[PDB]
Structures are given as C-alpha cells and as structure tokens.
Design a binder for this molecule. Sequence first.
Ligand SMILES: Nc1ncnc2c1ncn2[C@H]1C[C@H](O)[C@@H](COP(=O)(O)O)O1
Ligand SMILES: Nc1ncnc2c1ncn2[C@H]1C[C@H](O)[C@@H](COP(=O)(O)O)O1
Lengths: 672, 670
Amino acid sequence: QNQVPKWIQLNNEIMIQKDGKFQFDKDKEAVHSYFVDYINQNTVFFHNLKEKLDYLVENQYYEEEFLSLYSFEDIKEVFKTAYAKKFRFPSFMSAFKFYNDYALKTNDKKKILERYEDRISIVALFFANGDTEKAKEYVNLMINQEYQPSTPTFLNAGRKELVSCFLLEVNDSLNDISRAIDISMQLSKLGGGVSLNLSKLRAKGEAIKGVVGVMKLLDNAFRYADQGSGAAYLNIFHRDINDFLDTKKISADEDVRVKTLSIGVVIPDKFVELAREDKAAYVFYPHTIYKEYGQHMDEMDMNEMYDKFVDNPRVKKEKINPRKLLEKLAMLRSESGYPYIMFQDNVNKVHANNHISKVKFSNLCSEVLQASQVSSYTDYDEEDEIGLDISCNLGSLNILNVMEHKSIEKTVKLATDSLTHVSETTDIRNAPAVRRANKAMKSIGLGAMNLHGYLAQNGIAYESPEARDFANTFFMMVNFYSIQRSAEIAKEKGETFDQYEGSTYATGEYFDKYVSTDFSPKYEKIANLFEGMHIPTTEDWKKLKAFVAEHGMYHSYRLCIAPTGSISYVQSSTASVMPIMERIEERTYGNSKTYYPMPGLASNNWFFYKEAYDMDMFKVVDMIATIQQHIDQGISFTLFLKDTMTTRDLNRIDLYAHHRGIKTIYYARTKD
Amino acid sequence: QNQVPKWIQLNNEIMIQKDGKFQFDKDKEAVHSYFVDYINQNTVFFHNLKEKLDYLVENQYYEEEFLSLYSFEDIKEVFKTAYAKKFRFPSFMSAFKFYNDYALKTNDKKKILERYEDRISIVALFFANGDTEKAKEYVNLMINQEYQPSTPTFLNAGRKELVSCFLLEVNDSLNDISRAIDISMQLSKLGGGVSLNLSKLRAKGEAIKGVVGVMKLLDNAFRYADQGSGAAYLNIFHRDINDFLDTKKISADEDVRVKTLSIGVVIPDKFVELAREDKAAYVFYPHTIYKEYGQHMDEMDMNEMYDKFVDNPRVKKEKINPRKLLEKLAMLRSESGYPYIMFQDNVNKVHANNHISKVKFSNLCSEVLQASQVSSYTDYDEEDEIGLDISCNLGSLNILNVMEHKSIEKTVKLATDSLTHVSETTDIRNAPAVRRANKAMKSIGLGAMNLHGYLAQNGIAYESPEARDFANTFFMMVNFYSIQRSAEIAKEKGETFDQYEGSTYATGEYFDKYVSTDFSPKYEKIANLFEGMHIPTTEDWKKLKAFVAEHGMYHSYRLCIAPTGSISYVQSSTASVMPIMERIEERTYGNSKTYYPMPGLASNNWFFYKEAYDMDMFKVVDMIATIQQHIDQGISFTLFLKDTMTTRDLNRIDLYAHHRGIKTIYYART
Ligand SMILES: Nc1ncnc2c1ncn2[C@H]1C[C@H](O)[C@@H](COP(=O)(O)O)O1
Ligand SMILES: Nc1ncnc2c1ncn2[C@H]1C[C@H](O)[C@@H](COP(=O)(O)O)O1
C-alpha cells in the first residue's frame, strides 16, 4: 500500500526522536529489514559453492587462473573462514554501499551473485596466489575489518587492471602532448585517475617552427570516453599560472572552463618568501630558460636560481604581485574548491629519493608524492627516451579495529604483502614510462581510516593534544612495520627498488629522528591504549636501520593516506584521518531519504563527534602535521570552512599549513 | 683421495650463513688448504735457480735466447724481486685459475714447474730484452698487479707465436678464398681468433652459393679440431645479409648452418637514416658495383653513393624493409646472442688513419678496429699483391691497483713498452699480409679491467654520473700517456708507422678535442681519488700535440678494451670495463661445485655490486660511450638482457648505442 520500503521507514525513524534522544536502535532494525525484505530476496540461487563457482567461471564473471592454483577442498575452507565470523552490518548505509556499489551482480544488472563474505574470500584467494593459509589470514584481516583494499582493488579483484591512480609527465612538444593525451585515454578506462604535469610546457606567446590548450584537449578527451576523471598540475612560477587558475572561475567562459579536470598548484618556499617580505614576483617563460640553461625550469632549484633568472636578459619574464596571487588562490578555493596546493619544499625536505628526482607534482587526490623523470616520444617509436612516470595501488588500515584486535604489526605487513602482490601482477602495455616505473620503483600506498571514530569512542577530542599524541605513536608504528616488511620482502626476494643505494634509507639519513628521539606517548591515558602491543623504542629503530642497510628495501614508497569517501561506509568508519562533516548525514535515496549517524554515535560521545566546520582548522593542521611525520608520501587534507571567513582568514590557514610542514592541501569544503 | 678435497669443502662453507651473512672469511682458508695440501706437494724440486733454469732450457721447456742476454747475477736479482713481494692470492679461484691454466707443468700435465713469481720473472725477462733494471720494473708492475698481459702473451712468453688476434681481408675470387681458408687454419692452430671480411665477395646470382658458401666451408675446417675459434663480418648493404643472418637461427636448416663461426654485421649511418625516415631500402650485388664504378663496395662511401647506386640501372639490387631488418637483428641477439653490430661511421668519425683505409670490420671479440687493404693471391706467386691485414697483441691494466699505487703514467708507459716488444718480436711466416701490416702499422691493444671492482669498493654505483666522471678522467690520462709513449718510442727508435704523415696525429685534428674542453673530474668526490698524481690540462695536451708533430708516432693504434675473462680471475679483478654478472659465481668442479664472490665483495658494499641484468642498459651505454671518447680502437661491450624484454625493448637499446657514438656491441647474454 505504502511505496516507501520498510527499511527506509525504519531508517527515518532514527530522526523521529522520543525521550530526549535520537533512536539509534532503529538502524539495526532497518538494516535487518533491508536483508530479509530485499537483499536475501534478490540473491541468485545455487545448491552449493561448487555450483556457484562453476557458474561464475563458465559465464565469464570470475577469472580462470587464480582459482585453479587452489584445490576446491581448500577453497571451501577459505570461504568457510569468511562465513565463520557471522559478520553483521551495524547500519543501513554499510550494507547498502556494499551491496549497491561493490557486490557482483548478474549481466541483467539486478540479481545479487556475491555476499560480503564471497567478495572478501575471492579477494583473499587473489592475494595469496596459492598459499591457502595466507588466504585464511587475508579473510580474517578483511572480515574483522582490520584492512580494506581500495575501491578498484576490492571491486575488480578476481573478475574479468586493479591499479588505478597514475601520474604522467608531459614534455614540451606536440608528439609528447599527443601521446600524453592518448596514454590518458588508456589509463582512464583501466581504473580511473590520471594526473598530468604541465610545468614543462611552454607558455602562451612562445612560437614553434599555452597550457590551457592542453587542458582543453584533455577535458574534451576525458568527456569523449563517457571512466575515472583526470587532473593537471602547474608550478606557480609558470607564466600561464593565471590562465591556469581561471579555468575554475565561477564566472568563466564556456570554452576556457574545464569540467572533468581537477587542478593543482605547486608552490616552492621562494614564493612564500617573496610574499612575506612584500616584494614583487616574476613568473617565467620556461622554454626561454630551457634554451639558456639546458635544463627545464621544473627540474631546477628555484631557491637557488630565481635571482639568476631575473638578472638574465635572455630569460623572458612577467612581473606579478605574489600577495595578490595568494588571495586569488583563496578566492577560487572558496568559490569552487580548487585548486589543490602542494608546498614543494615541505615534500622534498623529508623525501628519500631526491637523487632520482625532486617531487614535482601530485595525483588526483593530492596524496601520491614520488620522484619522476620526463619521457621523449618521437615519430620513430624505437628512438624514444622512456622515463619514470608514477603508478601506485592503494589500501587503508582501520584504526579502530586494528587497536582493539591489537594487530598493528600484522595488519600493516599483510596489507603491505597484498599491495606488493597487486604491484607484481600489474601489466601495463601502452605506457612504457608507467610500465618501467612499476618494475623499477615498486611503489605502494598503505593509508588509514577511522581516526576520529576511534578517538571519539574513547572520549578523546580530535583537536586536543591527546589526540595528536595518539596519532604520533600510532603512525610511527605503521612506518616502523612497513619499513621492516619492505626489508623482509627485499631479503626474501633478493630485490630492491631501483637506485636504493642512493636513498636516505641506504645512507641512514632517514632514521636520524627515530634513532635520536622517542615517539612513545606522553600522556598516560594514551600509553594504556597501546597495552598488549610493543611500542618500538630508539634501540629497535637502530636495529631496523642496520637491517635495512644489509638487506635493502623492495619499496621506494610505502605509506599514503587517501580520502576514502565510499569504502569508509563499508567499514563503518569515519572517512580517512579527517574529522567528520556531519553527525547525521541526510542523503537522497530515490524520492525518499536516508539518515546515517556516524559510527558509534551516542549521548555518551555527542561532543567528541564534533563537526569539522566547528573546529579550529589551525589545530586540525597540527593533527595532519604530526601524522605527516611518519608517512613518506602525502595525506589528502580537506579544509572545512565557513561562509563567514574572509580571503584573509583563508590565507592565514593555508600559510600556517606551510609553516607547520604540510605537504599537500586537497578540496576546500565551505558551509553556511 | 676419493672424497671432496679440503680446499673445496672450505670454499663451499662461504654459502653457509653466520648471523644472516655469508662467510667470506672461509675462502682465505680455502686457498691456504689448496697450497699446503696440494700445490706445495706437487711442485718439482730444484735446489737453486741455476739448476732450475738449466734443466728447463735443456729439456726444451723455456726458450734459449732471451735468458742469454742477461748475466746470472742479474737473473738471480730479477727472480729475487718477485719473491720479495710475498704475493698471496686472496681467493681460491685466483690461485686455482693460475696454477691450473697458466703455470707451466710437466709434459704429462701433472707436476708444477713454475710458481706465480717464476711466471712473472720469465715474462719480465722476456719483455725487457736485456735491460735488467727494466726487468725489475716489469716484475713489480705484474706482481703488484698493476698490469696483466693477455692470456696468449702471459702463458707463452719465453717457451717452446705470442700474437693470437688476426683479421683477414678476402677478395672476390676462388683463388683468394683458397688462401683465406689456408691462412685461417694456419693461424687458428696456435690458438688465436681469426675474423674475416666477406663484404667484397660476390652474392648468389652473380656467376663465375655466395658468402654462406665461404662461411660453411670455413666452419667445417674449424669444426675439425684434432686450437682457437673463428669469426665472419659482413656489410649490411650486401644482398646475402639475410642469408648470412639465417646461419645462426634457433630453427637452423642444417645445410645453411654454422656452429663454430661467430658473426658480425657492419652498419653505416645511412642504413639507420633509412630506418628512421621509413623509406624502403636497397641491398646490393657487389661485383656489379666493381665493374660499373671500379672499386669494391665497402671501400666506397655509402652516405655519398647510396642514391647514385639506386639511380644506376646497370647495378643490380634487391628491395628490403630496413625497419624490419633491425628487428631481425634484435630477435637473433635475443635468441642466439648474435650477430655483433659495428656502427661503421661511429668508428670512422673518430678514426685517425682514414687515408690508409676506413675501418670496414672487427675481430673475434668486437674490439680491434683498424685500417685494412685487400690482397690478391693468384696462380703465380710473383704476381701476388700483398695487402694490409690486421694483427694485434693485447694486454690490460688493473684500474683498482693503478689508482692505489698512483701509477697511471708508469703502468701505461711500461705496458706500451711491453706490447711494443711483442709487436717487434712477432714472426708470422705463412700469412704475408699479416706480416706486412705488423711491420708497417706496428699497432697494439692496451686495455683495462677491474672498473666495477674499483667503483663498488669506493661506494660509487656503476650507473651513477660519479662513475662516468671517473671513467672520463681516467681513460683520458691513459690516452695522454699512451700517445706520449708512442712519440717517445718514435724518437728513441727513430721510426714511425707507414703513412703517419697523413694521419690526424700528424695534421693535428686528433688533438682538437683535448686542446679545448678540460677533462678534469666535475665531482669533488672523484677529484679526491686522483689526489697525488697529475691530471693533464689543456696546456699539457697542446705541448703533446707539438711533441708528436716534431718526433712523430711509432704505433698506428694503441688502445682497445678486450673482454678479459680467464686472466681477470688471476688478477682478482672484475672482467673488463663491464659490470658484474653474478655477485657470487657458482661453477662446477667435477661433481662438486666452487664459489667465487666477486673480488672485494663484503656485507656492507653489497648493493654497489649490482648485477648487470638488473641495471638500466641505457645507463651502461652511457658509461661505455664515456670511455670510447679516449680509446682509439673499440670496447668489447656485452649487453646484459632479461627475458622479459621484448624485441621492441632491445631494438631501442641498440639504436641508443648508435646515438651515443658506440663503435661495437658484442654478444647479448641472458
Ligand atoms: N544486519 C545484517 N547484516 C548482515 N547480514 C544480515 C543482517 N541481517 C540479516 N542478515 C542476513 C545474513 C544471513 O543470511 C541472514 C541472517 O538473518 P538474521 O535473522 O538477522 O540472523 O540474513
Ligand atoms: N694465498 C697464498 N698464495 C700463495 N702461496 C700461499 C698462499 N697461502 C699459502 N701459501 C704458501 C706459500 C708458501 O710456500 C707458504 C707460506 O704460507 P703463508 O701462511 O701464506 O705465509 O704457503
């Protein structure tokens, strides 16, 4: 009679509050209704697991070979390990987000083929590659919700290329731009994220015998393929910087604006210096530097060479006010959310592989921060000079379940092992710089989520010195055991990342802080949270230094924290290490609406679940800064602002971030 | 007697772990056992040096002449200089490879007649030619292991021909092919490699089987072993190029097949230009060019004449795809390791003696790059026109020990002196062109070894710019003092190689590069390695230029880097200027096995001893090209491939070598 489903009615009854409190009981009833009145009524029937796999293999849903490395007797034991837990989703959105987005369905995209246990088992069977007892550990890791592989790895593993997130580097030429566009199409379909570095390209007004032209070509190309979006990064000292920023003006033109492309700005310390002392700034025509000095502008140190570019008459320049350009960033970040900011020297001052290259730019989510070398694609393909692009596959720890299971070591190592397997199984063909990077650099991206949810459920405010003290110790341990496993893999395989000999891991310069100072918790309240787990001391780090020195390291880069917008719902976690935007999330379902309380929200902890826009973003910067200490790549840092804040107030946040050693700044969220 | 001997049991304990580390200490015990429990119990007794030398001269072991130039008091002092060093082999394979393969033994191959000190003393007394104080200098040079003469020179010096690298021209005639096989077998008997140039021979179609006929006929003679190997080179603009390449195939048709003979392909820039712009290419019939134009094909210049050959209707041709033919060369090197590529214009752009001839081919090991003129052997002996073939006696210096002792001048000077004495003493009887060229050209091949061993032990990666910076400054200094010694010998002897007056040394074009552009080390880390010895400035080269112009030059060619395989074990050195293959080398002894950690390998320097297969081959090409700047002949350059590389990837590497000025690329290992 009534069209609104019973599970939606029960979900909405959370808000119809009685006593003087919201009915958090009703979401457990709502999810139960979702299963018995819908999900279980739309699951394809099979007699047993034998019939189920044979159906999916023979009808081209699942891949052929990864299953054949196990006997069926062991496959049943692995699947049985997943179902043994009797995992239950605590909320409607948890079950909905999995069964709507992640669970395998029929070709007539209606009926459900995979349960939550079947997905995890298949993914576990893909990672282990024949080791049946390893798959059992991967099942226990993923079903206890200690580890969560990223959207592309978790969705596609086992089916009929897992690594999303690529970063290309374009050289100044038509062959290079045309290939960079063609390679972006191949990597758009394969997963999603493509991020181009346009700092090498020549400015508008330099002839051949600007960068917006390439950004429009990219935007049109990404739109042609209906399929993840792309992005473009540019150095602030580039001439077209203004035209680049004007592509995300709210009052822009139809042809100059880009819809698909996100934009990032790379800011060296020299630009902040000029702003502090109120001097004028000069933006450069990079090809005039190339002809003069031999090297690209983007490859040279601006803190040494800026003055020399100014005094040289052979280099073409453009006078600008840096303080006014910083205001323009803040204006656009308020208006549109873009651009992303990268503080180049805050990345490179703590960077291990500067000898390979300086980190010049970042990816779609401002998280991946690695070295890279430009390619040179010619008419005769056999005369190409292939360089180093960046490709990185992702995954996230669950801070809450890792702490309670006391599995901070094991969860890092299995995650690192699974990420290494995804890296090993990757086969890229039409992107030789991306293929060479995967072989040589062997990069992975182990992040984390559920930081607020953990802190809020233990009565610890996100922006207090307690919360920051916990994160200091927690993420130190993540870095310790990640490095330890990287060396253990390098011993077991006898392989290291290309030019390991030159890195700060090899020279020992990386370990100086961990050898000298002690990162165990100051507050006694937080020391007790790690009870039952050995916190590494300085003496342990000295041994880990010597172990790395002798056996090398397999991974060039290891840790990076992603935004994790969607998979966080599957895990019942607060998204990433960020604070929470809303206590209750009202979202449209389909003419009805759904309400989602944050995980573990109650009258006990209502004020520990403080909304992000109400926080002091200076103290939020302090949290990311203390976490950044023990993450060798970047952290996707969303700023949460109010409509009342001036462009003066935003510059003060952005420059405090730079002052505190923040590597990257993501999307700027603003609220009424 | 029938168990595993103690020295091997100790050697095998290197692979047994202690605290997660190898036992590199155990190999020093393995040598000491090898000496006490074998070598010292299988040396022949002589009471003194006089009775030893008398017995060895009397029983036809040593030669009579070279010893008679000294008095016995002098010979006693020269031997006594060798034993004064107290030289101790550090690893098992160093001592073993010497005493097993080099040290003189009794006629039944059992008991040892020479210690390491005895071998060096005889070689030093041979080289010095009566100068007793120079004999003492040679003993020190070889026993401090600053210099190592080549296998054939080091093994045979002062016993019952020392040169064992030959390159022969072959003219377009059956009668010339008869002597080509005749000479090849005469020179192959003594142990030397013999390379042939088959580019002048007429292709199949032209009447009188082709170049394959000569290779197959030559291969059968070589295959009759009861003595050294053989090779064959062919120009890429010759119609039989594809039949020539088909001999070394995976699915080789037994009629058109070659077991023993190594193969090389000579590639001018004009062929690479045709592949780049993607025009269809024309390979030629050579005897049609000879009749129409009056000269042999590979003597003429392909950059000038390619368009003229295609426009000429009388000259016969055959159209092929150049882009696919480079992919064929890459496929075959991935399969078999052959052919060798010689980038001809990368040789002849820097070649001094073009006026004699352009360099048309190379030797067995793709390193000797010299001028050559074809001979004409006929039915009447007195109407034979004896041309210029190539021989080259070899040697190479130790990069590690030269730098430690700071003897980069003294070693290059003396090594050049020792090679000159072998060059002088050579008496080739049944190869008239090889004899004539030895007298005329007077060329030598001073190389180098232990490059990686040196770099790795000073914390410098092989692929780094720091390494290239060392190589640039090091091999410049070698070339400086080698040219200086050649001019010094030219003044002392009062002699010069035939047509020196026409060379770029005489005209002064050779020194253009060095009179400008200072070749000191850029990096200060590298500059501190040469501390204590003088790095030649541009002004020093300007003075050398004039000294060469006044007094001339004795040697036609002076420097080539050979792939030092067997003798590098004796020196405790990494082979050649190449990178290392295996960190620890496992080889079968005889149902047991032996282990050789690369010399100076330790727990701490492990990652500087990178295995060559793991390296970026583009960065290795840059290292070889850096050295090639200062070596007037070629460098034996093995490319180290993994099986995951496509023909797409290997074709990209071979063209990059061409692009960086590489002269020759050798066997491809996997
Ligand atoms: N909350 C929740 N999460 C996951 N799966 C669920 C849930 N509620 C029911 N179910 C599914 C799982 C089992 O197949 C069955 C058990 O129902 P029951 O009567 O609830 O034990 O229904
Ligand atoms: N490594 C090595 N090389 C050459 N000869 C050796 C070596 N080890 C032992 N010996 C021989 C040489 C002498 O006859 C004696 C000296 O032993 P010593 O203990 O070495 O003083 O042992």
